[PDB]
């Protein structure tokens, strides 16, 4: 029980400090925003 409690207490730090993952969700958000921004920025091209 003590070992589990220590590990579950370290989770709250290692989730946002060690990074590793949690970049996948942000990457999904960033890819969606990039796609939408590029789509609405292509409206400024004369295309000839």
């Amino acid at each position: 029980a003590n070992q589990f409690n220590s590990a579950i207490g370290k989770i709250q730090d290692s989730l946002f400090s060690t990074a590793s993952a949690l970049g996948k969700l942000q990457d999904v958000v960033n890819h969606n925003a990039q796609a939408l921004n590029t789509l609405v920025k292509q409206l400024s091209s004369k295309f000839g």
Binding site: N37, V40, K41, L43, S44
Partner: protein, 48 residues
Amino acid sequence: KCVNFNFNGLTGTGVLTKSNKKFLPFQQFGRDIVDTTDAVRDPQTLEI
């Protein structure tokens, strides 16, 4: 009120509202981050 506005040849449709944006005296209109017109200057009242 959603209107068809024609500012000195610039044609568009939308609602024109009072703006807190401070245009420098040489600046005539403002563009959003994706190059869409966001603010305009009144030729008569010099209003943003």
